[PDB]
Amino acid sequence: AIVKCKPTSAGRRFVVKVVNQELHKGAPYAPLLEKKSKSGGRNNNGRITTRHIGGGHKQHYRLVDFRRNKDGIPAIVERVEYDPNRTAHIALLKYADGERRYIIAPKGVAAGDQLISGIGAPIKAGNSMPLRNIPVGSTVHGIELKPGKGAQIARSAGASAQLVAREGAYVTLRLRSGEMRKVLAECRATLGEVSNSEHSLRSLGKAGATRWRGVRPTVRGVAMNPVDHPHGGGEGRTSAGRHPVSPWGLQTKGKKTRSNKRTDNMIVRRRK
């Protein structure tokens, strides 16, 4: 489902698109939609605070059910949809009581599949259960950190985590970052991989496609004047002239920035 475009024009050369024909061709589920107005990555104060954000497409937010807390009641997937809010696909579960919900679609999940969450959920790659009921060695996604807070960890397209160890009240997961982390065994997770794993194979072909996604251009620091950037200045084209730093002076080649002593006990082994 990776399609390379023919070079019928400049800007179409090097366009590689993910075209999923199994996605829903109609409208999303209206009761689960919600207004989502854009910021230009701008603050409470009206200040930017996050550069390169602006001018994408209008998007409805989809109310994705991250706390799959309808334990016991089975569901039918019955649809997989496109979500503009995330790189993963979403599936519209229809529960046995008729309630409809949106969840992150797992890898092999198609319309008509049966998903269930709870303690006694069968071990198949769409189901959700607390991490203590997940056998060691399973591949999981959408892992809670706080019981009841909802899925937080493995959520983007193709994301997954590996359950490597299980102590008393904690479970050790291997994140796709390579970090070994401790998670409460009471926290819920969904078995399997997240869908749309081929999303990384796509290539935008042109400057416009990045603008379609709401990303404004990045200007290099060496292209500026010294008043704007630490890398600015120089007659002719020059390098940074100093150890590379952010526009606010923080070194950006190495120079670890993690300063969270509160959560340090949850990190077994650290990788990024």
Partner 1 sequence: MEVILLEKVANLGNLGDKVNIKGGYARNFLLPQGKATVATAENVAAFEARRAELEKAAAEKKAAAEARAAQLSELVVTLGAHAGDEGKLFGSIGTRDIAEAVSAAGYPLEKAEVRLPVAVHLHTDVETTLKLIIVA
Partner RNA sequence: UAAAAACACAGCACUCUGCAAACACGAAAGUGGACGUAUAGGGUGUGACGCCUGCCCGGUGCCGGAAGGUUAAUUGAUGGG
Partner RNA sequence: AUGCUUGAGGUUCUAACUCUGGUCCGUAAUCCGGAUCGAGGACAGUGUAUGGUGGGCAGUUUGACUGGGGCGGUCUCCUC
Per CB under 8 A, residues contacting partner 1 are 118-120, 133
Least Å distance between CB 119 and partner 1? 5
Q: Cα(52)–Cα(209) distance, rounded to whole angstroms?
A: 14
Q: How far is the CB of 112 from RNA (least distance, A)?
A: 24
Considering CB under 5 A, how many residues would be counted as binding Mg ion?
A: 3
SS3 assignment, position 163: strand
Binding mask 59-98 for RNA (x = CB under 7 A): --x-xx--------------------xxxx----------
- Please report how close the Cβ of residue 119 comes to RNA at its closest, in angstroms: 17
Length of the chain: 272
φ and ψ of 264, to 5 deg: -65, -25
* Amino acid, res. 162: Q
Rounded Cα distance, 81 and 19, in Å: 12
Residue 247 makes contact with RNA by CB under 7 A: yes
Query: Could you say which of 9, 44, 45, 218 contacts Mg ion (CB under 5 A)?
Result: 218
Which tokens sit at 260? 């969270």
Residue 100 contact partner, candidates partner 1, Mg ion, RNA, none, CB within 5 to 8 A by sort of partner: none
- Report the residue from 26, 31, 168, 236 that binds Mg ion according to the rule CB under 5 A: 236
Contact 61, 83 (CB under 8 A): no
Backbone angles phi, psi at 14, to 5 degrees: 75, 15
| Minimum CB distance to partner 1, residue 169 (Å) | 10
**Nearer to partner 1 by C-beta: 20 or 133?**
133
How are beta strands 114-115 and 161-166 bridged, if at all? unpaired
Binding residues vs Mg ion (CB under 5 A): 218, 220, 236
